[PDB]
């Protein structure tokens, strides 16, 4: 199989079964298959949130709203944050629990990674891979945004301008 480095063998617990598997788990975080489930959950969620984060950072600046690290000087962030926490706290508790219910068998019921929203029915393993590969690229780019902010102190698109002049 193809791997994250030219001639590297895969770990034995990574067998290509799950989407995104390019044989990369050196510190064996996922030898136990329950921990591999949790990690898969975490990777898809971190993944999605970074897509919304990156799009939340770039797309407004294109449609003339401002630079993403100057966002809280034109809004009242403390307020919004409280509302954001008020929408999250049920919603993330349901996602963790598996559904609405004080029983523990609730966690077995339902999917906490792929809950089943799909109205145009295009969930495959080639599309599950696309989520994860877009997600990983958004995570990596978010770390680039923060870093450039700190170093250059200017807009992310103005960092792209300096590449070409």
């Amino acid at each position: 199989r193809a791997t994250w480095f030219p001639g590297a063998k895969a770990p034995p617990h990574l067998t290509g079964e799950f989407p995104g598997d390019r044989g990369f788990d050196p510190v064996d975080f996922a030898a136990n298959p329950e921990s591999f489930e949790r990690m898969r959950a975490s990777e898809v969620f971190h993944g999605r949130m970074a897509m919304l984060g990156v799009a939340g950072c770039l797309i407004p600046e294109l449609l003339g709203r401002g630079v993403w690290f100057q966002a809280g000087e034109s809004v009242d962030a403390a307020q919004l944050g409280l509302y954001f926490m008020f929408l999250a706290a049920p919603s993330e508790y349901w996602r963790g629990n598996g559904g609405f219910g004080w029983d523990q068998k609730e966690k077995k019921a339902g999917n906490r990674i792929y809950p089943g929203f799909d109205p145009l029915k295009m969930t495959s393993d080639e599309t599950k891979t696309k989520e994860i590969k877009n997600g990983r690229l958004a995570m990596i780019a978010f770390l680039g945004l923060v870093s450039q902010a700190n170093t250059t102190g200017v807009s992310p698109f103005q960092n792209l301008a300096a590449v070409f002049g």
Binding site: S147, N150, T151, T152
Partner: protein
């Protein structure tokens, strides 16, 4: 693990503390700055202007590091 982790990362971490906390505070103190009116250590991290006055290279941030300059 003991070479790369315990001693390696241990030295990296402690160089990190030195660069970001021990070097400013000592530099200011050696120029007679009365410890009561010294900035707290995070202030060197949050406000890069404080640490820029002392060491101007910080104004270039991490770009030199990544371009091997």
């Amino acid at each position: 693990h003991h070479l790369s982790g315990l001693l390696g990362l241990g030295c990296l971490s402690w160089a990190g503390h030195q660069i970001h906390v021990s070097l400013p505070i000592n530099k200011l103190l050696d120029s007679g700055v009365n410890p009561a009116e010294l900035p707290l250590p995070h202030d060197f991290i949050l406000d890069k202007s404080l640490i820029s006055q002392l060491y101007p290279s910080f104004s270039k941030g991490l770009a030199p590091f990544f371009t091997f300059h």
